[PDB]
């Protein structure tokens, strides 16, 4: 019955070129800016973390060098801006 026209589909079209050329080039720019931003952030963090663990005695050099599973069950409700 109504599987024929739905599967075939109809290519719809209508335009506004204000809605056709808003310059994704700036978009690409600002987005690579943001990503390099957060990358520099994260990498400095990484590096001082490795430094931190380094800065401890052999007690944690053997007891804090291993990646751990205690972070694994880190459930965390995200926001709800209206309590139910």
């Amino acid at each position: 019955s109504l599987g024929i026209f739905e599967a075939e589909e109809l290519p719809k079209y209508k335009l506004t070129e204000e809605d056709g050329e808003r310059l994704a080039k700036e978009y690409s720019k600002v987005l690579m800016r943001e990503h390099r931003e957060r990358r520099a952030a994260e990498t400095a963090l990484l590096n001082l973390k490795k430094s931190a663990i380094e800065a401890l005695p052999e007690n944690l050099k053997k007891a804090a060098l291993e990646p751990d599973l205690t972070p694994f069950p880190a459930n965390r409700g995200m926001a709800t801006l209206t309590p139910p």
Binding site: L10, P11, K12, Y13
Partner: peptide, 29 residues
């Protein structure tokens, strides 16, 4: 792509592909 001119010659010699419905919805408005 080139299928554009392919359909050009197709409508020049023959006519009426699913471009029948295409042009139908395009000529409705």
């Amino acid at each position: 792509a080139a299928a554009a001119a392919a359909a050009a010659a197709a409508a020049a010699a023959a006519a009426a592909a699913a471009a029948a419905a295409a042009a139908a919805a395009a000529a409705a408005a």
